[PDB]
Design a protein around this nucleic acid. Structure first.
Ligand SMILES: [Zn+2]
Length: 254
DNA sequence: AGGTAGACTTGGA
DNA sequence: TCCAAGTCTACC
């Protein structure tokens, strides 16, 4: 899920787990756990702790327990579910948090591509993967000035810049190409080649692209190669930029 | 030492 | 055979 969806998940999941106490943690794929290194340590430390809160930082969810914080990333195909321990698990379930009330918080992922890290609460923010995370795109902390500073300072493409989690949090391949199209900027453009007016415009479309998503479908370019541009009719093209598939309209973007 | 490549994972083109 | 995805860690 994208940032707006992770926020919806945060809001939806919280009341379903707040106040519950962990009685067991079952792990069917140890490598999902990145910290501590031993998945058995991860499981052991969480038992006995009660869920007190749930926050979001970019696309990461931060589950707040008594002493610890669980940092989890679903990436694109991961998903959570709260259900009864009495029912069979869904296919591809990799980690299950069992509560004392017989309910469970479950992480499933056909791609088995998610990650989890646990640290004492006070340390979470200064350790990977939250360390270095850029400002929230819908916050005052993400401004044209911030964007310009990073832009006129690197030799990378504007796309490579926007994909950088340390620049601003939350922009993956899709919102990057969409934002660039809406700002009228070619993705292969050097970040430094951007004029002041362009930076300002890009900041604006990034915020809109992020906010509009949540308080395919509605896509201008991503995955639409060979189809007419919805604004000018020119066929959308696809190329490789910053090592990623990149979609853009050669007429609308310059 | 910014910046790029590798590693992670596996259903499908 | 190889691409997709997001974000780390490994090194020119
Ligand atoms: Zn166009």
């Amino acid at each position: 899920p994208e940032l707006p969806e992770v926020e919806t998940i945060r809001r939806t999941l919280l009341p379903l787990i707040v106040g519950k106490t962990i009685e067991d943690v079952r792990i069917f794929w140890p490598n999902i756990i990145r910290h501590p290194r031993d998945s058995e340590a991860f499981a052991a430390r969480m038992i006995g702790q009660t869920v007190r809160g749930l926050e979001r930082r970019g696309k990461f969810l931060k589950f707040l327990l008594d002493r610890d914080a669980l940092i989890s990333h679903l990436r694109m195909e991961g998903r959570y579910a709260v259900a009864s321990a009495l029912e069979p698990l869904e296919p591809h379930t990799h980690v299950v948090f069992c509560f004392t009330d017989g309910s469970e918080l479950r992480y499933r992922d056909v791609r088995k591509f998610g990650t989890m890290h646990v640290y004492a609460k006070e340390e979470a923010d200064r350790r990977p993967p939250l360390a270095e995370l850029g400002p929230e795109p819908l916050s005052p902390a993400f401004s044209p000035a911030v964007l310009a500073e990073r832009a006129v300072k690197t030799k990378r493409s504007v796309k490579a810049l926007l994909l950088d989690c340390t620049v601003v949090a939350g922009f993956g391949n899709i919102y990057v190409d969409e934002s660039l199209f809406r700002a009228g900027i070619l993705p292969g453009r050097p970040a430094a080649s951007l004029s002041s007016k362009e930076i300002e415009r890009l900041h604006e479309e990034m915020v809109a692209t992020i906010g509009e998503a949540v308080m395919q479908h509605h896509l201008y370019v991503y995955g639409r190669q060979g189809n007419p541009c919805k604004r000018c009719g020119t066929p959308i093209e696809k190329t490789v930029v910053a090592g990623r598939g990149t979609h853009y309209c050669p007429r609308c973007q310059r």
